């Protein structure tokens, strides 16, 4: 039913009350600080690649894999032998007078075998991930997730991998093909996802029924 209690994926308050700020210090200056947070050094001309645990990176999946395999074999043998007089000389009647030497035979053997296989997959999404840890060589372990609830169900797109901090180009973007340990999941929930399951009996027949 649609009246069953449910928790939206975007939990918690959707509003934030702005903080008034700090009362000025009567030091004679109009300028007033705002309690600086981060004191780390930041370069100016570098490409702002992710560098720490909290840094975020953009991943363009653009995955396209296609593999094919084919094989065939054949073998055909055909033979036919015949021999007949239909008229035998008087002197040769002893050996071929009757159908004794008359012979006819045929034989065939044809075999044909074939086999094939294909496997293709594609992925054309964009997902922003967050650094999980920094490796010894500087490579970043990136993990990210995105949940979308269009209506009547939810879809989770999760990505994980190791990104070398030199393939990141320009606007903090790196193709998924350049990420090692690529783990990509695109799963769904609800009756829409349930309708794509085989069913227990059909699955059992598929895994066990002969032929």
């Amino acid at each position: 039913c649609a009246w069953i209690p449910a928790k939206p994926l975007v939990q918690g308050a959707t509003t934030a009350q702005p903080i008034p700020g700090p009362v000025p210090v009567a030091n004679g200056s109009i300028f007033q600080s705002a309690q600086p947070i981060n004191y780390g050094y930041q370069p100016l001309f570098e490409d702002r690649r992710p560098r720490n645990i909290g840094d975020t990176l953009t991943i363009v999946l653009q995955e396209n894999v296609s593999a094919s395999k084919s094989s065939s074999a054949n073998a055909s043998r055909d033979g036919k032998t015949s021999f007949g007089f239909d008229t035998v000389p008087r002197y040769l009647q002893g050996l071929f007078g009757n159908s004794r030497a008359d012979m006819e035979a045929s034989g065939g053997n044809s075999f044909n075998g074939k086999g094939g296989a294909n496997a293709s997959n594609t992925f054309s999404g964009t997902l922003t991930v967050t650094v999980d840890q920094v490796l010894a060589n500087g490579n970043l372990h990136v993990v990210g997730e995105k949940q979308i609830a269009i209506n009547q169900g939810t879809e989770f797109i999760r990505f994980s991998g190791v990104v070398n901090p030199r393939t990141i180009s320009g606007s903090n973007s790196v193709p998924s093909t350049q990420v090692a340990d690529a783990r990509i999941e695109y799963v769904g929930n609800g009756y829409i996802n349930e309708a794509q399951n085989m069913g227990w009996l059909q699955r059992f027949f598929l895994n066990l029924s002969p032929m």
């Binding site: 370069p43 001309f45 570098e46 690649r49 180009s169 320009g170």
Partner: protein, 61 residues
Amino acid sequence: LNNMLSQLGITVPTGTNMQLKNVAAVMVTASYPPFARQGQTIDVVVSSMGNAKSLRGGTLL
């Protein structure tokens, strides 16, 4: 130059003009002297590699 920029932290897109004329690819040759020490310094010879017109006031990096 793109490799050096990427190492320094700048990643230029693969498809770009990059038509510069203030740099020249060079080969540097040196004579490792006998009993060379770690902190010592030696003289080097820099020779243009491509089609550079001159290396009058250049800097080897």
